[PDB]
Amino acid sequence: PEVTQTPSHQVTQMGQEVILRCVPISNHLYFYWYRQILGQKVEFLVSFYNNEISEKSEIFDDQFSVERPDGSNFTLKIRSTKLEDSAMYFCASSGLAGGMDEQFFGPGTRLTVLEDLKNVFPPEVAVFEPSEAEISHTQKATLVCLATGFYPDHVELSWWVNGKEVHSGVCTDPQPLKEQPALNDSRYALSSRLRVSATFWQNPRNHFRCQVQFYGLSENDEWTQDRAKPVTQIVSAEAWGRAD
Amino acid sequence: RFYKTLRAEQASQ
Amino acid sequence: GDTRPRFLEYSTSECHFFNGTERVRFLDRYFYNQEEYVRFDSDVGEFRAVTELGRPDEEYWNSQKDFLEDRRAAVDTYCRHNYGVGESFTVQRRVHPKVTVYPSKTQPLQHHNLLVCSVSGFYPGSIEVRWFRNGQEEKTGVVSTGLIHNGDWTFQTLVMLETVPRSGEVYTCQVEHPSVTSPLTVEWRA
Amino acid sequence: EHVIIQAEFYLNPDQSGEFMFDFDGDEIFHVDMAKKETVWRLEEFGRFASFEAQGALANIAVDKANLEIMTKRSNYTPITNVPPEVTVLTNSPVELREPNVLICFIDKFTPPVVNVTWLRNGKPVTTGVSETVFLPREDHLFRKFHYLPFLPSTEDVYDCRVEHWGLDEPLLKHWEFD
Amino acid sequence: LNVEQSPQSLHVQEGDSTNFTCSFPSSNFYALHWYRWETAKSPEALFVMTLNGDEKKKGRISATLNTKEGYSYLYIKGSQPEDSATYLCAFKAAGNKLTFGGGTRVLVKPNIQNPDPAVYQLRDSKSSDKSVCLFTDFDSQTNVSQSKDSDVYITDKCVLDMRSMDFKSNSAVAWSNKSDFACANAFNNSIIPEDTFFPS
Ligand SMILES: *[C@@H]1O[C@H](CO)[C@@H](O)[C@H](O)[C@H]1NC(C)=O
Ligand SMILES: *[C@@H]1O[C@H](CO)[C@@H](O)[C@H](O)[C@H]1NC(C)=O
Ligand SMILES: [Cl-]
Ligand SMILES: [Cl-]
Ligand SMILES: [Mg+2]
C-alpha cells in the first residue's frame, strides 16, 4: 500500500519540458505534488480531487500542469525548466475527501536542471581489496569501493556477493564529496565499505561486486562531444576471494 | 478568529 | 420554463446550543431531493441510515475511523469553537427597535378604526408588545402579524388594536425588548 | 437557545452550488462560487471574524461527487418542484418622499433556483438592487430575499416577478402606496 | 502560512532520550502531522494530531499537541540507530495542503564495543590508479576532520553493522592520486588516539 514514482532521478537541460509520472494508492481520493529545494522546506505545489485541481501554489499554473489520464496514473508537467526547478519532487495521495487522514508520499524524483549537459560525467568505479594486516589483526576483511568523477550528484551504490545484494556489513557515505570544491560545476566522489569475516574473504569461491547506478543523459538528449554519451548506466568493479 | 468548516466526505460507491 | 429533471444534493451541519455552551447537540444531515437519507447525531455517536438510500453510507462512514472521530469531536472543535468565534456580534447582537404609533384609516371619532403599532429594525427576534387603553392593558382586539424576519439581521412587527375611540381616550403602546433597559412607550390620543 | 447551521448544496444539470453559515435564521456568510471568496452578510462580520473559502470549495467538490453517486443510487429519480410563496413588504412603515426599501421574500420552495426581477410601472429595475442566497429552513425547503431601495411616490407602482419551475406562469407580487 | 521546527539538527547517543519542537499558527487549526523521513526512503506518517492536549504513542515515539499555544513536541525515548531520520511536522488548515516545517535531522550515535582504532592500506585496484587508507574500529567520540590538503580526499565517519555478528564499527576513507601520501600522515587534522594500531 504505497505510492510509486518514476524515474528515481532525472537530468534535464534548462528550458526543456519534463514529465514526472506517479502512481497514487489505487482507492485514494486526493492526489498531491510537493517539492523540496535543497536546504529549503518541503513546499506544496498542487492537490487534485475528482478530476479537478483543488488547491494550487502561487507559482503553479504559470509554470506547471497536472494530468490524470487513467485511474492509475497521475503526472506533473513542468512547461519550461529553470535552474530553480532543481528539487526533489514528491507525489502524495490521501484516502479521505475530507482531509482528516495522513498523506502517503512517494519515494520522490530528484530533478537536476542544468544550463548545459557538457559537464555530465559518469563515475569511474574501483574496488580496493582488504589489507592483509587488518586480516592478521582483526580476522575481518574490509573491501572499499570508490565512485569518482561523476556529475551531477546522486548515484546509487550497491554491493553484490555471489550475485546477491548485501546490506549487512555495508556502509556508504550519506552524501558525496566534491573533487574540486571551489568549482560550481565540480565533479563528485562517493565511497563505500563492505566488511566480511577473514574466512569468508579467503574462500576463493566467493565473488565480490560493487555496482554504481548513475543517472545521466536521456535517450532523446543531444550529444556532440567525442567522449561516450554520459547516459544513465551501471558502472561496476569486482573482486574475487584470495586464500593468501 | 476563524469560522471552521465541518469537512464533508465522499459517499459509498 | 425548462422541463429537464433536477437532482439536488443538500447537507446541513447543525449546532444546537442549550444554556450557553453547557449542552450542545450536533447533527450532520444528508438530503437527496428533499429526502434525508443518513445522519450523524452526537447523542447517537455514530452514522445511522434514515432511509434505504442512506444504508451504504451508514456502513461505509462508520468504518472510516478518522472521519467518524471528526464527527464525535464536532461538539467542541466545531460547534463550541464556532459559537465563540462570533459570540460578540451574534449572541450579543442588540439592535434598538424603532417605534411608531398611527391609525391605519382616516376614520372619524366614536366609530371603528385600527390603531397600528409598528416596531421595526430590531435584533434579536424576541419582543413583547403591549397595548394600553387608558393606563390599563387591552388583551382583546389585538391583531398581530407576528414576528417578521427582514433577512438582514433585523426584524419587524405590526401590532394593531381594534379601536372605537372617545374624545378623552389616551392609547399607549409598550415595547419590552432585550436591547432596552427602560421599556419603550409611544402614545396616541384623539 | 441558539442554532448554527452550515448549509451546502449542489444542483444538476444547473451545476450550481452553495455554501453558507446561518445563525438563528440569519446568514453569517456564503462562498461565491464564481469569485471563490467569502461574502460576509454584514461588512462588520469580516472585521470581527475570518473564514478560509477553501474549506467551503472542498465541501462543494464533495457534494458535487456525492450528487453523481446519489443520482445513480436513486435510479435517476428527479426532484419534485415545490412552488414558492411570495410576499412584498417594506423595511419600515411607508411615508411619501422619505427613502425606504422594498423587501421581496421568496419562501417554501425547492429546487433552490429562482428568477426574480423588480418591476416599476411594468418596467425592470436594477438600481441599488441586492439579494441574499438560498437560506435554509427546518422543513428543508428554501428562503430568499430581494431588496429594492426606493423613494415612496403616488405616481409609482412596484412588482416583484418570481419565476420557479413549480409555478405554471411567473408569479407577480404587487405593491403601491396607500 | 508558516511552520518552524527546532532544532534543525540533533545528535543523541544510543539509548538516550531526546525531543524536539514544532511551532505552527494558532489560527484556523485542523491538524498537525508528524512524518519520519529516512535518507533514501519516502516520508512516512507517524501521527495526525487533531485534539488539543492529546498524547499519541507509536512505541518509543510520543507526540503532544497544544493548539492554543501553537506547539507540538516529539519525544524519542531510548533512541535506537533506526530512529536516525529527518522528522518533519506539517500543519493543516481548512483545505488539504500541508505547510511544512524545516524538519529536525536526528543522528543517533551508535554504541561501539571493543574499540581497536587502526589505519590500514588496502591493495590498489589493478593498477595502481590511486592509494586508499582506511581508518576503522574507532569509538564514536573520535571526530573525522576534513582533508586540509586539496590533493587528498577524506570521507566522514560511517557505521557498518554485521547483523549476524551483532558487531558495529566506525570507518572513514582517505585517498590520493600520488605520491607522498601514506597511512600515518593520512588523518593528521583528525584527533587520532595514541592507542591507534599502525602495521609496518
Ligand atoms: C430504474 O430506471 C429504469 C429506466 O427508467 C427502469 O428500467 C427501472 O424499472 C427502474 N427501477 C429499478 C428498481 O431499477
Ligand atoms: C431563468 O432564466 C434563464 C434564462 O431565461 C432560464 O434558462 C431558466 O430556466 C430560468 N429559470 C427558471 C424559470 O426557474
Ligand atoms: Cl476572511
Ligand atoms: Cl495517529
Ligand atoms: Mg481560529
CSV table of C-alpha atoms and ligand atoms in Angstrom, one decimal, chain B residues 2, chain D residues 38 40 46 49-52, ligand 3:
chain,number,residue,atom,x,y,z
B,2,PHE,CA,-11.8,31.5,12.2
D,38,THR,CA,-16.2,34.7,1.3
D,40,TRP,CA,-20.0,38.4,4.6
D,46,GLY,CA,-15.5,40.3,8.1
D,49,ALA,CA,-14.1,37.0,12.1
D,50,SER,CA,-12.3,35.1,9.4
D,51,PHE,CA,-13.1,32.1,7.1
D,52,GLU,CA,-10.9,30.1,4.6
F,3,CL,CL,-11.7,36.1,5.8
